[PDB]
Nucleic acid binder design. Structure first.
Ligand SMILES: [K+]
Ligand SMILES: [K+]
Ligand SMILES: [K+]
Ligand SMILES: [K+]
Ligand SMILES: [K+]
Ligand SMILES: [Mg+2]
Ligand SMILES: [Mg+2]
Ligand SMILES: [Mg+2]
Ligand SMILES: [Mg+2]
Ligand SMILES: [Mg+2]
Ligand SMILES: [Mg+2]
Ligand SMILES: [Mg+2]
Ligand SMILES: [Mg+2]
Ligand SMILES: [Mg+2]
Ligand SMILES: [Mg+2]
Ligand SMILES: [Mg+2]
Ligand SMILES: [Mg+2]
Ligand SMILES: [Mg+2]
Ligand SMILES: [Mg+2]
Ligand SMILES: [Mg+2]
Ligand SMILES: [Mg+2]
Ligand SMILES: [Mg+2]
Ligand SMILES: [Mg+2]
Ligand code: NA
Ligand code: NA
Ligand code: NA
Lengths: 114, 34, 121, 57, 123, 204
RNA sequence: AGAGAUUCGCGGUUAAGGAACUAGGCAAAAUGGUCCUGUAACUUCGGGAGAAAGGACGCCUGUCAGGCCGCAG
RNA sequence: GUGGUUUGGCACCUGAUGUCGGCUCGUCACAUCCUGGGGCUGGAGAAGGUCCCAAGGGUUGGGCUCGCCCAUUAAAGUGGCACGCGAGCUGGGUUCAGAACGUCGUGAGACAGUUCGGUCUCUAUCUGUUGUGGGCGCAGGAAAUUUGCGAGGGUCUGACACUAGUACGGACCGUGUUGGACAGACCCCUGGUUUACCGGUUGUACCGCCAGGUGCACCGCCGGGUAUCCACGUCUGGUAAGGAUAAGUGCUGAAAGCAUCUAAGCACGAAGCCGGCCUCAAGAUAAGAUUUCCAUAAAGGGUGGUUAAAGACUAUGACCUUGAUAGGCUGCAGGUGUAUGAUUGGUAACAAUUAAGCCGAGCAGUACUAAUAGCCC
């Protein structure tokens, strides 16, 4: 009789997604309201952090846009995520890749798993 | 402009004089007030 | 989270390169400005042969923040820099190009002409 | 910093009202027939709750 | 405030506290009963029961994990020898603390902590 | 009118329009009427409600007789509520469906206890001077506590160090997200005073 | 010996901003090694000068190159 | 005429009443800066100007040291409180010994002057204030739930949109939407801490050695980090005016056949007053009310034990064996990030497979350990 679990199960939102961890390159398709239209925006980048409990987790994705680094935090239960696709699987040695912030060009590459 | 001022005369409860009571109401809602 | 004496990149094709925040507009003791907020700036460095002069007091709208911004749908966005766009007295863009991405919050800040941006995130 | 006046005997004794030695919490242990502190090992026999806890030769 | 902070610092720096707990654990393993202060015994219990549980896996890995805490080879040998066979199939609660009295020099509350399976009289 | 509750914890859910709502879960639980207070006898109208099931081991003889008169099983927590629409008798049972038509509720609780706190945490004092520039030992001091010989006293109500928290607090106008009768659950938007497991009063 | 309130002493970390503090950048932070490049005004021709500004640095293999690991040598 | 807030007059208090600005913390007045309500206008509207009532709440950050300037804001009010506040801070200025310049003096030295440097002591007795207990009282003893005599807190405000570019450039009134500041609570989110914990790595020492560990070097350094505690985070609040009024607006109406808001009566009319909202609150000795129980084991308690999201000590809460109170144990959420060994590869440094391993302040289950009804009212 865990009331928090009951509440989470009744209010469960979102969809199942393919497994991924920090260091993987993923594309997130996000629904956006541009006034009155329904658009899908694609955001591709590296997962640098996952944190939280169970289905209430949040993941941070980092990308480079016009030479300006961008980070986006998504709730993995968010109903605005329409699809997640894992492009490349990474090989890292730690859970949080905060060191990627101070790196650019060939210095910020991540080794592939296979 | 559906709002409207509504003032109604009513006898006083402590003196006994026809005092006024005012409120704003919708245009269609004036029937319930008066 | 931009306050007085914070230095910002100028993200348009006007002459200014860097700007210093003089004041955050909007009320007494209003400390911080975020994306879509209007600030007063002093221009700190310009390109050679720049239309705007060094030391010119101007208005600007913040378009990128290093500190993360929360959206009502539970998402957050943060950038690697702090960037603003200069405005004239009428409240319009002083330049003609925008460099780098801008926050999606600028759509509702009555600042639709920043749709010159390469990408709205 | 400094007492403006010396305290009277009355004032000193009134403050000392709450200075008291504490009585120990003593149980009887009716078998051995002598005092010991409640929730401790009976130091004479070495028993505790009717079981030999400490054996003395 | 110390809301939900669940270990006693025992008036020591962290390294001193860890060294003292290690020494106490070796002493308790070597001599099956020791006399201490009540607060030190209560801290030692939480420290020392996981170490005794680790002997339920008779492996080189578990021996090395236990040695990382003990750093005493005599205590390690006794622990993975006799103590393990004695506390086998006991589901926790290997130790017992009983209060005895007070010291003369500082009125400290004193007790003894012992391994339960080595007190035949208390079973 | 209202009911007694127990704070379970916080979570965050998604609404129908896609808004991340912080949420407090409360077990409102079956409350039994244990005494009806009337104008004729008590001088005011109220209902006494009991919340958490107790045992005879933890019920004293006076309270045991009180519950025996009410003809209910003994309860742990008792509280009084007024202005109840509809008549209720001795031993009636009220559940979380009592809030099934409320948009907003009031929650009374006991806040977390901080113990003795200084002026900086308790009252937001700015501290004396800076960390450097000649500071000796007044970084968290109160400063002056009065004026010179003219008042020649510290005024009543001067803000000083002392006990902070562990007191009764009311949070107004918390939106109700969902009533869950099958588990006696109430979901409110926002936070309520106290730690998990504390007893709350929930007023409609 | 306990306990781990306030407050002080000596230390550690800190989002975003970066002297806005203050009489005053006081204190703290920062700089820091070896080798190799490269060093302005001025000068009493000795200096200024370690000016300033850059690059390399771990381990293994082979006669400086090839490889290996880490956020960081 | 009033004030005592300027320059003065007097010399009544003073074996020390010891110091200008700034900081911190306030408190009061109203001679009102903003917000609220009105009269007059040389008030078309819109801006204003002057006067009246009104002290509830607000009343910025900088470059310079009363004042000037920069950028704001609804606004950046004036005064009292030993020109509030140094047993609360500071030490820039001022009072001191060093030194220099200008000027005066034969000189020692001096100054309507300037310049660089120059020890801020005290363990809080009484009262005061903020918190927290013990005793007794309240008709004999108690467990709960309470009424409210009273006290304290709270009280701010912007920009938009429609009405309507209409009434007369540009409205009053009316309605709706989002901000700033402040306060309370809270930790799901974001962010911080996290000398619990996990990993990487330099030097050195020890276990012949190796492997694997461990001590010390700021926690050696470095990268992360649960609970807790937090703000940079999140929720919630401040409205309106129920009653009586202020300045003012009026009805009817004499003294005074007219007039007149008043003398008899009666409507109105402010962020101001009393309430409403929140917290405390029967030592409110005027010690209140209701329900229930009433002496000894566990009617009520105390001492004691296991402890806590409760706490300086206390007090408060839970549990004390027909017991889940704390620990352990068995599982999970979760932190770290792939151990030890064995193979397979590589000449090697190393890589890959295998189970990761370690921890788990949180959650659930479970009497293994500890919680003896002993002693005293
Ligand atoms: K006085
Ligand atoms: K930083
Ligand atoms: K300055
Ligand atoms: K948390
Ligand atoms: K944490
Ligand atoms: Mg005493
Ligand atoms: Mg200490
Ligand atoms: Mg507490
Ligand atoms: Mg400070
Ligand atoms: Mg000093
Ligand atoms: Mg100091
Ligand atoms: Mg910082
Ligand atoms: Mg300043
Ligand atoms: Mg210095
Ligand atoms: Mg005379
Ligand atoms: Mg004297
Ligand atoms: Mg003064
Ligand atoms: Mg002083
Ligand atoms: Mg003083
Ligand atoms: Mg001299
Ligand atoms: Mg000097
Ligand atoms: Mg150390
Ligand atoms: Mg040494
Ligand atoms: Na001369
Ligand atoms: Na009685
Ligand atoms: Na646990």
């Amino acid at each position: 009789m865990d009331f928090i679990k009951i509440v989470n199960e009744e209010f469960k939102s979102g969809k199942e997604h393919p497994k991924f961890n920090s260091g993987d390159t993923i594309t997130v398709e996000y629904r956006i309201k541009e006034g009155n239209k329904e658009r899908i925006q694609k955001y591709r980048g590296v997962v640098i952090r996952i944190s939280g409990h169970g289905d209430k987790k949040r993941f941070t994705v980092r990308k480079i846009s016009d030479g300006i680094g961008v980070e986006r935090i998504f709730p993995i239960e968010s109903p605005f995520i329409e699809n997640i696709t894992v492009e490349k699987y990474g090989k890292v040695r730690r859970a949080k890749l905060y060191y990627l912030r101070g790196l650019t060009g060939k210095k910020a590459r991540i080794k592939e798993r296979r | 402009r559906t709002y409207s001022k509504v003032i109604k005369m009513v006898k006083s409860p402590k003196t006994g004089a026809y005092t006024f009571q005012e409120e704003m109401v919708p245009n269609e809602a004036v029937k319930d007030f008066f | 989270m931009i306050q007085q004496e914070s230095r910002l990149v100028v993200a348009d094709n006007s002459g200014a390169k860097e700007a210093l925040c003089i004041r955050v507009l909007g009320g007494t003791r209003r400390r911080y400005a975020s994306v879509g907020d209007i600030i007063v700036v002093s221009v700190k460095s310009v390109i050679p042969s720049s239309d705007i002069k060094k030391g010119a007091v101007s208005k600007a709208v913040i378009v990128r923040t290093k500190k993360e911004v929360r959206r009502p749908d539970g998402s957050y966005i943060r950038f690697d820099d702090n960037a603003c766009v200069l405005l004239n007295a009428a409240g319009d863009i002083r330049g003609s190009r925008i460099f780098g991405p801008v926050a999606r919050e600028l759509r509702g800040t009555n600042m639709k002409i920043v749709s010159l941006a390469p990408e709205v995130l | 910093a400094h007492p403006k006046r010396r305290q009277s005997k009355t004032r000193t004794a009134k403050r000392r009202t709450h200075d008291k030695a504490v009585m120990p919490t003593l149980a009887k242990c009716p078998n051995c027939g002598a005092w010991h502190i409640y929730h401790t090992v009976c130091g004479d026999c070495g028993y505790y709750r009717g079981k030999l806890a400490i054996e003395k030769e | 405030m110390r809301h939900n902070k669940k270990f006693n610092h025992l008036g020591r720096k962290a390294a001193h506290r860890k060294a003292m707990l290690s020494n106490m654990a070796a002493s308790l393993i070597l001599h099956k009963r020791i006399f201490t202060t009540v607060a030190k015994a209560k801290a030692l219990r939480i420290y020392v029961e996981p170490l005794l549980t680790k002997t339920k896996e008779d492996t080189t890995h578990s021996r090395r994990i236990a040695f990382s805490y003990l750093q005493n080879k005599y205590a390690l040998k006794e622990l993975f020898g006799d103590v393990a066979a004695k506390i086998a199939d006991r589901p926790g609660g290997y130790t017992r603390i009983l209060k005895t009295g007070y010291r003369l020099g500082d009125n400290a509350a004193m007790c003894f902590i012992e391994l339960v399976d080595y007190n035949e009289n208390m079973l | 009118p209202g009911l007694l509750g127990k704070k379970i914890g916080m979570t965050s859910v998604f609404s129908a329009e896609g808004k991340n709502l912080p949420c407090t879960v409360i077990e409102v639980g079956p409350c039994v009427v244990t005494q009806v207070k009337t104008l004729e006898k008590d001088g005011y109208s109220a209902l006494q409600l009991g919340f958490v099931d107790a045992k005879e081991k933890h019920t004293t003889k006076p309270l045991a007789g009180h519950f025996k008169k009410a003809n209910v099983a003994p309860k742990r927590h008792l509280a009084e509520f007024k202005n109840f629409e509809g008549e209720h008798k001795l031993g009636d049972v009220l559940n979380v469906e009592f809030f099934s038509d409320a948009d907003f509720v009031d929650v009374v609780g006991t806040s977390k206890g901080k113990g003795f706190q200084g002026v900086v945490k308790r009252h937001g004092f700015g501290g004396v001077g800076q960390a450097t520039h000649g500071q000796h030992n007044r970084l968290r001091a109160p400063g002056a506590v009065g004026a010179c010989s003219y008042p020649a006293k510290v005024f009543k109500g001067t803000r000083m160090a002392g006990q902070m928290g562990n007191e009764r607090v009311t949070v107004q106008n918390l939106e109700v997200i969902k009533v869950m009768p099958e588990h006696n659950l109430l979901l409110v938007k926002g936070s309520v005073p106290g730690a998990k497991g504390s007893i709350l009063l929930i007023e409609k």
